[PDB]
Design a protein around this ligand. Structure first.
Ligand SMILES: CCCCCCCCO[C@@H]1O[C@H](CO)[C@@H](O)[C@H](O)[C@H]1O
Ligand SMILES: CCCCCCCCO[C@@H]1O[C@H](CO)[C@@H](O)[C@H](O)[C@H]1O
Ligand SMILES: CCCCCCCCO[C@@H]1O[C@H](CO)[C@@H](O)[C@H](O)[C@H]1O
Ligand SMILES: CCCCCCCCO[C@@H]1O[C@H](CO)[C@@H](O)[C@H](O)[C@H]1O
Ligand SMILES: CCCCCCCCO[C@@H]1O[C@H](CO)[C@@H](O)[C@H](O)[C@H]1O
Ligand SMILES: CCCCCCCCO[C@@H]1O[C@H](CO)[C@@H](O)[C@H](O)[C@H]1O
Ligand SMILES: CCCCCCCCO[C@@H]1O[C@H](CO)[C@@H](O)[C@H](O)[C@H]1O
Lengths: 257, 257, 256, 257, 266
């Protein structure tokens, strides 16, 4: 039971993050851009899988996709780059613990969110240039998924955003609670398996879904307005999951009061 | 063999548990709520898998479910949160070893059970909010499974509860006997694989099964009375498995006379 | 590091007899746990056997093998007393003069009986679940028990030999590594090999027969059949664990 | 984050590579040759798989290929041999951090490329000598893939080269950021799964694809020209991903300014 | 790097190996017998899989077989027993580094080879005793495979031996380069997956294939003549892959070329 020690670590991570931004916006945005790109790589992989298996009428499609998404957050954690969603639990916890302020928190959130988007846009442009979404089941999978994500009612997206960032943030929490990098990766694998296959919504992964779909000439299904709609609802849910549940929760567990 | 060392660890853990509760009810309940919700996350995943594969008439359904449940107790162990079924072995061993009283034991059992339920209820509510059990295979898998669990004879449920918590508690026992976080997860993975696929009954997991089934307007195959009937029977079996077998068993192995 | 490994087996054999001498209750409880833990693996893979056989899957025996790891993993990770592993440990320690032949047949008899008690307890409770009342799982239990009891002695014996080479070698590996993950992986590999290849394990068979005989579901087994298989497989296990692994590890580690 | 220490490790690794070359061309070229062959060994495996599953009409072909390619970079990393692609991030980061010169960088790039090719040629010759590509589904998978890679448009190969080496190099980046050899291998497995299954292009791996196809008398439709066309386009893409993204990126993250 | 330390370890191993053989021929042959039998255990498993999936017309057959062969070298490495094929790299490297002599080498190679063969025969004899190859797809898989290996052209068998032992030895090489036992097993799992599925030939493993078939009663369609053929070709291949490639390779990488006390790099 190292709840106190854990809260200390979260607090210290929150302090490191705002310090980094204060020290250098370039370093912070480059870090954020890597993470958004790393997450997008997971999307490129499982949407390829989605296309191959959906085309095949496989009933295992969504299961194989969940099993195969682990690389997204594994890369972020193993490279120590800045990810908006995890920042929800970290900043909220550290703020509550008086290590950082409400101002530092909204700042980290806004920069990391925008920086992650930069990575998704860059990934989308390059992926399109591969010609891999020119035509076929993979392009179709992007188009249909982007459309479904954009036409889904707000309430549903929001709540899917909550459960998603509970899983993402708890996998980040595990990485703070162990010294085994392998166990970190395993826990990340399990959590991303759970959230992808269950149907939960991640704001940063979705950036790449819309990035690819919008930059691609072969895909005329969704528009920027749709992307913004989905992203706003999912981002708000992510925040509630990561800050209101995980952040507030771990503070309460760890706060020597 | 380290049987004494293990008993000392169990005894320490029991003491630390009752101290947390005595120190702060809010912390204890928040911790319990977390565990309940983490276990529930496993149910959402494997029930999604259930619906998917059952609809397709796959023979692998229950095997894939068992293989995919690991996250449930993996999250509990890696976050160090209070789980009722695990507390059955810990408090019991510690009690026999005079580390904690009978009253402490009943108190810890009652609070964790309720806290676990709070987490299940919350998860259930939010999950229904996702729209993910609005219609289709997953909703039907929840409704049908909840029903078959609620109509099964008491004796059958009881004994399934015994075998389940032997497995859950032995997976917890293993984590007290290794310093390797990966080995803990692996053993947890194996144990949950065994108890899910074999057909054994877990009270805290069942909490989420019924919270979803009752909170969802598209699920009316069961009633509160049914959920209560199952929970009582299964809880009773869980307790026997955890305290009578694992608790007393580990006490006997490690008690220097 | 053969020498140090022999030392480890010798100390383990010494610890076993000392435990039995100090407390029969503790030794039999430990034994009962191991038998139950192994039985748990049988409950899992026979559930799988039922499900996949019913479906005419060619992968049935391959999935059973991959899924049996929990059986010896639980034993190893809980530090409980398993008969089959004891065949190598005691024989090695015996040849090394850490324990006597008398100690060895005493440990072998007590762990065997204690393993059985675990199997019986498990069978009874598992039948109580109603999980083998009817269906392909109950049928897989009945059919497997029946085929194992009717098989010729010589076949069971040699299948018992190869099974315990694999089981005891996985135990040997656990003495040669400080990594718990490595132990479990080798156990996984070895049980995969012995289940899927079709070798026979006495202790696991105990649960096969306690379940089949405790279940009112009609089979062609009988107690005479169970005892037959158990005797044939146990002797086989003993040769493979004692004559091969026990003797071999002693020869490798003995400074002579 | 340990960005400074990471950049420091990259720089020392770059310094060590040029040192080795300057000390002994034979040593460096033997190391390079090993890496090229180790990578080629991955190709023999997944192209055997590709053949078997292609001939079966399995929709899982590319998924199984991706999952089975881990050995390629795992061997390189575990043997500490010189691989051209990974050298793109390492020499560029080290060069930006003023540990090695631009000349050292293009020297290491030229020598490791040629060394890698020699391994691929040695492997290709020996493989053909086994008679495994005399005829059949594996021979045809080598023949057809070599052709489709040689006839693909430059821009598509280029961008696929970029994304491939971001994945290879980030997997190399991870090996620099953990002391766990198991975690190194898991991350390599993930990154190679992602790049293979997604369809990205790797220059060194293609060397073996073309050595096998060209050395094989089992008639096909490639030619040295087509091989040169593909290798040039993919190599340039690899360089951009490894140097311009990963090298520059990690340099900015860890630079003391 | 760290090739120099690795070369030291290979040299020390070759030394320990010849010391043991000189200390006790009984201890060395028992070790070699274990290793041969551990490898064969892998064959019994994956050949059972062969039969089961071949008879079902599965396309995943050779993939599942490759994935399932890891136990063979995993047991050898984890038990620290003497396996002929690994000895090709070890002895050759140590020899080049002047830790052991050409005579020392050929003696280890000869004794380990024979020791491994003993384990296979003993394993084959016991396996047939199970009746598991009395009749059916598994018995047939052994028969058919033993035939094809015995009736394959020499050059092909030779080159398949080379690539096999490159893969077997590089996995042994990885075990010298890591302190993580789990990573050792994983790398072994990968290399044996690759070598089995790709279709390369391992001499020691083939000792059990022919052992089972020549001790098996249900027909032959083979002949010891075939076994000797295969075993001879594959063995020379193994030695080349292990000694010429991996042995010489690691030496070159790790020999600090100050010394030079004899030869010059460039
Ligand atoms: C490529 C350039 C990216 C620029 C992103 C800047 C996002 C600014 O975001 C704003 O930052 C303020 C502090 O400056 C905070 O007070 C606000 O809460 C926040 O919205
Ligand atoms: C975070 C959401 C991703 C925003 C990426 C916007 C990139 C838009 O990209 C543009 O989209 C237009 C239509 O939408 C197309 O007509 C253009 O061809 C395309 O370049
Ligand atoms: C949401 C608030 C949850 C409070 C749960 C408290 C229920 C306590 O319940 C009782 O606790 C006693 C000790 O206090 C035990 O002795 C009794 O066995 C138990 O029934
Ligand atoms: C895909 C599942 C494979 C899991 C492989 C587990 C590899 C973990 O590796 C193990 O990690 C431990 C940390 O707990 C360390 O103590 C051990 O030294 C190390 O071998
Ligand atoms: C421990 C078992 C969980 C009990 C939670 C009961 C919450 C019930 O909740 C109610 O369920 C009714 C039907 O069941 C619905 O008609 C109502 O809309 C809903 O509010
Ligand atoms: C639940 C009761 C089970 C008790 C099992 C006791 C079996 C004793 O077994 C016997 O023990 C003797 C020494 O006591 C040895 O000399 C014999 O070799 C051994 O067969
Ligand atoms: C047998 C294989 C020998 C290969 C030696 C390659 C020598 C490469 O040499 C390098 O080439 C670079 C461009 O190619 C130049 O930029 C460098 O100045 C030059 O040193």
């Amino acid at each position: 039971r190292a709840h106190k020690e854990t809260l200390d670590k979260l607090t210290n991570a929150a302090i490191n993050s705002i310090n980094l931004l204060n020290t250098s916006k370039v370093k912070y945005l480059v870090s954020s851009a890597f993470a958004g790109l790393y997450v997008g790589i997971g999307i490129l992989l499982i949407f390829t899988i989605g296309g191959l298996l959906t085309d095949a009428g496989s009933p295992m499609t969504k299961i194989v996709m969940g099993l195969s998404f682990a690389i997204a957050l594994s890369l972020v954690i193993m490279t120590g780059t800045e990810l908006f969603t995890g920042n929800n639990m970290v900043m909220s916890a550290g703020m509550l613990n008086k290590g950082v302020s409400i101002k530092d928190t909204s700042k980290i959130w806004a920069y990391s969110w925008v920086g992650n988007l930069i990575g998704a846009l860059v990934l989308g442009i390059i992926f399109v240039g591969t010609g891999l979404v020119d035509k076929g089941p993979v392009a179709e999978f992007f188009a249909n998924t982007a459309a479904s994500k954009a036409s889904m009612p707000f309430t549903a997206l929001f709540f899917r955003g909550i459960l998603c960032n509970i899983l993402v943030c708890v996998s980040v929490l595990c990485s703070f609670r162990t010294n085994s990098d392998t166990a970190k990766i395993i826990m990340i694998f399990l959590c991303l398996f759970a959230f992808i296959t269950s149907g939960f919504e991640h704001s940063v992964a979705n950036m790449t879904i819309y990035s690819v779909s919008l930059f691609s000439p072969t895909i005329s299904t969704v528009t920027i307005g749709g992307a913004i709609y989905n992203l706003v609802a999912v981002t708000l849910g992510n925040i509630v999951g990561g800050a209101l549940f995980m952040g507030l929760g771990t503070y309460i567990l760890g706060k020597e009061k």
